[PDB]
Design a protein around this ligand. Structure first.
Ligand SMILES: C[C@]12CC[C@H]3[C@@H](CCC4=CC(=O)CC[C@@]43C)[C@@H]1CC[C@@H]2O
Ligand SMILES: O=C(O)c1cccc(CSCc2ccc(Cl)cc2Cl)c1
Ligand SMILES: O=C(O)c1cccc(CSCc2ccc(Cl)cc2Cl)c1
Length: 249
């Protein structure tokens, strides 16, 4: 089971937000912390993507590209998994030092999005996602958003992505026999993967808006997040980069 040994080996540990929970909950302080958390998770995402099977087959510019388009979806999905395993999805477990309860949801001014993330989180429970299904789904999220005109080497990207689809099909299928089941299950996992995208997009709009007005509102964006949110998020927002959906929406 080489493919899973690797996914299971390179999975990131806990990342702390650095939030001072002694501060009173405020928009400026909650969002600044979520932003630092994002900066910190990006270092780990980069290191993890580059250790994935087949990832350095991609053109070097394409490597930076797929990471910079898909981090939001990756991080949302993983946070939903954390939330699911650490607090049965009752709260959003951004990090051990930044757990959102209902008060933090309203104060962050992202109540509706948080609610949608909580929903995502509860699906892991509703569908009984195994840890192997989770790891393979999250790997496939690295490959689920690309420019409409293609990458530098799109042919490589297509092959890699096809392979990651087959690995997920394999993880479902090391277990079952009479194949209504395997067929139903693949359908649920692809539907769940698709559902990450509309949420990632709401958060794209949100953080963009907020970067634009950050000075007026005392929210800090660190270097990389400011750069990625000014340079790559708008390509998504302007429709020049789009998610790859399994089913028509
Ligand atoms: C992008 C963002 C900072 C980073 C947040 C993001 C919401 C989802 C999220 C979950 C994580 O586990 C890491 C941080 C991130 C990626 C936030 C929405 C508004 C804020 O600007
Ligand atoms: O280097 C970083 O920490 C960073 C920060 C934000 C976004 C990305 C995407 S780069 C992924 C990558 C691909 C190829 C090479 Cl040579 C080198 C790299 Cl770092 C990387
Ligand atoms: O072990 C695996 O499952 C695995 C998973 C993903 C990718 C790869 C290697 S694919 C990388 C690749 C890139 C371009 C082309 Cl044309 C052809 C290929 Cl085979 C192997």
């Amino acid at each position: 089971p080489i493919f899973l040994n690797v996914l299971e080996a390179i999975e990131p540990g806990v990342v702390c937000a650095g939030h001072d929970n002694n501060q009173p909950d405020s928009f400026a302080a909650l969002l600044s912390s979520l932003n630092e958390l994002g900066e910190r998770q990006l270092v780990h995402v980069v290191k993890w993507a580059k250790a994935l099977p087949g990832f350095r087959n991609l053109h070097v510019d394409d490597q930076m590209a797929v990471i910079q388009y898909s981090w939001m979806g990756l991080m949302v999905f993983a946070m939903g998994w954390r939330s699911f395993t650490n607090v049965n999805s009752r709260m959003l477990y951004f990090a051990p030092d930044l757990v959102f309860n209902e008060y933090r949801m309203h104060k962050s001014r992202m109540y509706s999005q948080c609610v949608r993330m909580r929903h995502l989180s509860q699906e892991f429970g509703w569908l009984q996602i195994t840890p192997q299904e989770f790891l393979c789904m999250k790997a496939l999220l690295l490959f689920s958003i690309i420019p409409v005109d293609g990458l530098k080497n799109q042919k490589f990207f297509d092959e890699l992505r096809m392979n990651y689809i087959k690995e997920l099909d394999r993880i479902i299928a090391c277990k079952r026999k009479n194949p209504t089941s395997c067929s139903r299950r693949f359908y649920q996992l692809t539907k769940l993967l698709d559902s990450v995208q509309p949420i990632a997009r709401e958060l794209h709009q949100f953080t963009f808006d907020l970067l634009i007005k950050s000075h007026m509102v005392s929210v800090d964006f660190p270097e990389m997040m400011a750069e990625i949110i000014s340079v790559q998020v708008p390509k998504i927002l302007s429709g020049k980069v789009k998610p790859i959906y399994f089913h028509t929406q």
